[PDB]
Amino acid sequence: VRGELGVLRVGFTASSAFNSVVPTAIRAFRRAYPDVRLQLEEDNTTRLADGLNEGSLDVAFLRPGFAGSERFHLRMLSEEPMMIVMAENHPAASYEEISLSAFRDETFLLFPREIGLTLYDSVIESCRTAGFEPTIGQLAPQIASVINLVAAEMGVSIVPASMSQVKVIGVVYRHIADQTPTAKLALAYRRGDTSPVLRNFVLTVFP
Amino acid sequence: VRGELGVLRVGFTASSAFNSVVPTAIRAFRRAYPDVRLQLEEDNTTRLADGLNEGSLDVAFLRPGFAGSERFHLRMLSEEPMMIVMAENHPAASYEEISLSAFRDETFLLFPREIGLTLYDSVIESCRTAGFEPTIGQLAPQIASVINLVAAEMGVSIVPASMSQVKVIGVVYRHIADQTPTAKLALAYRRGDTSPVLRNFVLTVFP
Ligand SMILES: C=C(CC(=O)O)C(=O)O
Ligand SMILES: C=C(CC(=O)O)C(=O)O
Ligand SMILES: [Cl-]
Ligand SMILES: [Cl-]
């Protein structure tokens, strides 16, 4: 009955909390191991990987593919389509089918690349696969902040599909008919960290 | 034509971005002063006030009432009701009218008090006015994170009404029939900071 006491420091990105796997895993662990204290931290993949490396986090829900990710265990938990988010009165909002080529001259809002290089680069790659280099306008700190600026008609963005729960008045979400990479979420933890609390958490997320 | 170039560091809390005043003000300023670079930071009132004090922020959308707030200019921008957020299958979800006394023995999820003492204390005060001391369960980093854990049926919370745009599957928002303090948002900036860029921003938010 090891690993039933202690504190586990658990990190996740702000957008990842909107993917059901994150609350589902947290709730499942709290039920199975009620005496373990979950200290939750919300931060982007760059910071979460740094926290794992320095020992200030024990496990993270982050986006895979960052430089040096092979130094950790990463287990895929969710892959989801990306969607376009735009103002409700954007001309493309009444299109039967959305193609990214419609936005070749449109301003894209994004978050700063340095906080999450893989997801940022996947938005860029999506536009490149559609044949253009996106014009990037105002940067906002998180995807939820980006969406709120989309409501103010400052541009469009590309977001994990689960962000379509964020029904800010004046925005719409549309599926992309073009081929686009998924947004990816993995559970991440240190190699050779044999803590029984961490093991109990990992085996709760992957029964 | 002073203050039409430079960088303005503008802070706001994660939940405040969901109040229309924040995107409305940002868009209005970007239109009126296109050459000024808006560097946006999303952080809680404690950090935003510290940033103003140390000069790493020039202006913030924050919640008024913090210790030492008299050292800054605060101009009220929005007051909004607070609402209860709960799982869709919570027994109170099918009540005609919601009273906080229904939750006297219910677990409340919250964010850590230290990041935003006034809003946290106003949730506590709401329950006290309804006649009870709330039992606080799992803490999550931001209000949006709290809402996602409410979807996993880990408790209920009390949120600014504009967070009802965050339609996480499995949660519902209800108005509170009890008297509760508003959630409050003010524009905050340093006293005796005579920068023309900051002045142009303040006068855009308050035309
Ligand atoms: C902005 C991001 C990118 C990241 O942190 O990897 C997110 O919310 O997941
Ligand atoms: C959690 C808070 C409280 C604060 O930062 O004042 C918010 O999102 O506004
Ligand atoms: Cl492996
Ligand atoms: Cl004053």
Numbering used by the authors:
A (entry chain A), B (entry chain A): 86 to 292
The authors write:
The bacterial protein ItcR is unique in its ability to bind to itaconate. Structurally, ItcR is a transcriptional regulator protein with an N-terminal DNA-binding helix-turn-helix motif and a C-terminal itaconate-binding domain (IBD)24. Multiangle light scattering (MALS) analysis showed that IBD appears as homodimer in solution. Here, we report the development of a highly responsive, genetically encoded itaconate fluorescent biosensor, referred to as BioITA (biosensor for itaconate).
The IBD was expressed in Escherichia coli and purified by affinity chromatography and gel filtration. Furthermore, the crystal structure of IBD without or with itaconate binding was determined by multiple-wavelength anomalous diffraction and refined at a resolution of 3.25 and 1.48 Å, respectively. In line with the result of MALS, the IBD proteins form a homodimer in both of the apo and itaconate bound states. Notably, alignment between the structures of IBD in the apo and itaconate bound states demonstrated that monomer in each dimer exhibited translocation of over 7 and 10 Å in the N- and C-termini, respectively.
